[PDB]
Design a protein around this ligand. Structure first.
Ligand SMILES: Cc1nc(C(C)(C)O)sc1-c1cnc(N)c(O[C@H](C)c2cc(F)ccc2-n2nccn2)c1
Length: 292
């Protein structure tokens, strides 16, 4: 059984809350290991470990259970418990009915049918929610390493939605692989060049997430491959503003993408700037593009 340290304290597999398998019912697949919607009545997302896997896969699975169970913050998905004493093994997460952020943005883009389905303020609230999660990780000296829209979840589709960081598979791998798998489009130069990760790693990635949000779910660096992005960013290149993106919001992005990690803002500053954007009528009165 592997050890794990967060906020100082060390924990073990024994500290995980084991839920009796009989209390757990699977309802439907969500996507593929496989994840199901389930009930324990508490509604849960059930992350499963394939019964056919390597011992490294097992260790990875246990470790992410330890990681998520030890966080306590409103913008990080909760772990209800685990079921490790039956096969296949389960990790039980808070079921975020809004689904993942990237799908949400893609499916909820304003259109002729729904012209105002989404507004700038909705995007700013998502951005603020995730930044608050990142600030919590930063102040607890946890480096996420893969801050990206695909790794965020929403509590519901409607205006009251809350965004949370929902996946920690990358930080898990490095805590203990391939180049064409590293999220190079979300990584700062010192990360993909030198393998150096610091709190300022997540700041850069958050800038890219910001772009994903205000582009409404487009893939970063449109039309560029990983290697072209690597060379582009290493040469000082940066993404243009998303369509209709207010200057104050783009400015947050460009500050997140400063070449020197020391020149990039910490998350307390990012949150201050996101707050200012939400107060600025010129920002929130800006209409999102309508997709025909
Ligand atoms: C209801 C629901 N619908 C979704 C769609 C199909 C739109 O994508 S995801 C989703 C959901 C809700 N709550 C969770 N706790 C949860 O967790 C998994 C581990 C997860 C966590 C992430 F951070 C990112 C992605 C995924 N993931 N997505 C598919 C498979 N894995 C998923």
């Amino acid at each position: 059984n592997p050890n794990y340290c967060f906020a100082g304290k060390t924990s073990s597999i024994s500290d995980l809350k084991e839920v009796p398998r009989k209390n757990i019912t699977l309802i439907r697949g969500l996507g593929h290991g496989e994840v199901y919607e389930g009930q324990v009545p508490l509604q849960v997302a059930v992350k499963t470990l394939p019964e056919v896997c390597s011992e490294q896969d097992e260790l990875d699975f246990l470790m992410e259970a330890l990681i998520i169970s030890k966080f306590n913050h409103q913008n990080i998905v909760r772990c209800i418990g685990v079921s490790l004493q039956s096969l296949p093994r389960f990790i039980l997460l808070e079921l975020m009915a809004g689904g993942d952020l990237k799908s949400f943005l893609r499916e909820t883009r304003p259109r002729p049918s729904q012209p105002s389905s989404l507004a700038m303020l909705d995007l700013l609230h998502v951005a603020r929610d995730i930044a608050c999660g990142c600030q919590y990780l930063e102040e607890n000296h946890f480096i996420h390493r893969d801050i990206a829209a695909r790794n965020c979840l929403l509590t519901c589709p409607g205006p009251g939605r809350v965004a949370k960081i929902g996946d920690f598979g990358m930080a898990r791998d490095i805590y203990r692989g391939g180049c064409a798998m590293l999220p190079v489009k979300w990584m700062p130069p010192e990360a993909f060049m030198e393998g150096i990760f610091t709190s300022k790693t997540d700041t850069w990635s958050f800038g890219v997430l910001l772009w994903e949000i205000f582009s409404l779910g487009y893939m970063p660096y449109p039309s560029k491959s990983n290697q072209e992005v690597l060379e582009f960013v290493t040469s000082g290149g940066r993404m243009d503003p998303p369509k209709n993106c207010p200057g104050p919001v783009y400015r947050i992005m460009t500050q997140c993408w400063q070449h020197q990690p020391e020149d990039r803002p910490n998350f307390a500053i990012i949150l201050e700037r996101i707050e200012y954007c939400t107060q600025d009528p010129d920002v929130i009165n800006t209409a999102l593009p309508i997709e025909y």
